Structure formats: C-alpha cells, structure tokens
Amino acid sequence: MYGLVNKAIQDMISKHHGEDTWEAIKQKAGLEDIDFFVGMEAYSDDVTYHLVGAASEVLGKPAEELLIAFGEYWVTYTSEEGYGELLASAGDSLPEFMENLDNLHARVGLSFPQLRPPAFECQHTSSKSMELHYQSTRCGLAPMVLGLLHGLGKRFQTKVEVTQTAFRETGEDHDIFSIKYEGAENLYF
Numbered sequence: 001m002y003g004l005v006n007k008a009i010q011d012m013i014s015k016h017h018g019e020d021t022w023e024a025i026k027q028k029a030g031l032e033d034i035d036f037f038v039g040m041e042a043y044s045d046d047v048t049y050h051l052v053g054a055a056s057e058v059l060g061k062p063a064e065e066l067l068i069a070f071g072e073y074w075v076t077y078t079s080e081e082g083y084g085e086l087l088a089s090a091g092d093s094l095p096e097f098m099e100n101l102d103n104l105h106a107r108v109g110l111s112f113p114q115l116r117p118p119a120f121e122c123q124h125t126s127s128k129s130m131e132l133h134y135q136s137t138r139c140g141l142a143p144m145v146l147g148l149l150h151g152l153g154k155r156f157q158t159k160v161e162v163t164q165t166a167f168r169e170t171g172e173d174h175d176i177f178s179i180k181y182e183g184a185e186n187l188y189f
C-alpha cells in the first residue's frame, strides 16, 4: 500500500505507545532497512500486514483491535496530512459521504496513481439506516471499516451502530455492514 498508510501506522503507534515500542514493532516486522516511509511511494502490502502482526505481538492487542483503531485514526490523519478538502467535498452528512467513497478514492488516485482502492455501495434502508457493501482486492480489513465508520460518526456528530451482517470468509461475495445512525434525537430523548 502507499507509504501514507505505513506512516499513519507509525504515527498512530508512536503517539499512543512512544518511539521505543514503534522501533521494536518495526524490527519484529522485518523493516529496519526501510529507514523511513515516503507517503507517495508504493510498498509491498507485506509491509502493512507484517506491521499489524508485529504490533499485535509487541502491544498484546489482536489484529482486529488495531485495525478498528487505525480505521478511526485514518479519518483524522487524512484530513490533517492535506486531504481535508477531498473529505469535505465528499459530503455534508454520513449518508451523502458514504455514496461518494468510490468517487473520493478516484480523486485520490490522481495523486497516488497505483492505488488499489476499496469499493463501497450504499443501500439506504431509510434516513436512519443503511446496508454498506465493502468489496476489496485484499483480505482481512473489514475491521478497519468498523473503525472508519466510528470516525465518520464523530465527523458528522452522528451516533452510528454497526453490525457486520455478511462475512467473505464464510463464502459471501462481499462484507456487508448494517448501519443505524441517529443525531440530536439520541441526546434529547
């Protein structure tokens, strides 16, 4: 994946766990030779997956737990490393934003020309509810989507309940996420 993902992982770990840890994790993963990650440089996917497994071990947290946290972090990280304007243009509400994710990764592709973006399809079951279809060229990153949606909840000041209703490793087409999202009414009543 692009070095931007790998720096984001480095920055997330260096923030919550201090720099000694991150360089322990970097060693377990087998990546000392890489003196640092370049955002715009494509890397073998190995680099990302190996960091996650190294992080899981050194930190004693499951891959799934780290992915869920990363997914939330990425929302923040992207808006602060100079992609705030893409995020902003993609929508002014969760439902709007969800429908333009492919369009967003299309726009990202201009800056990152070897991107292998994910694919999202939105089925609006109401103005409080949606089915999210996630399709990926890769395995094992459905948990990141949990995290992302939690970040997007905060983004739109919306409370988002997410249960994954379909799982690819049970032989389904794509991961499906059933999504319940409510604003001010959660608070006042």
Ligand code: HEM
Pocket: 001, 002, 004, 005, 075, 078, 079, 083, 084, 086, 087, 101, 104, 105, 108, 112, 114, 115, 116, 117, 118, 119, 135, 136, 137, 138, 141, 144, 145, 148, 149
């Ligand atoms: C400005 C905002 C964003 C940027 C710059 C961005 C960029 C990227 C990049 C560079 C990758 C790595 C893929 C590769 O190198 O081939 C990626 C992966 C991914 N992005 Fe985005 N992204 C953005 C927003 C989002 C948002 C809002 C979501 C919300 C759901 C999302 C979901 C994902 C997922 C799930 C992956 C994992 C790859 C896969 O499924 O195969 N991204 N993105």
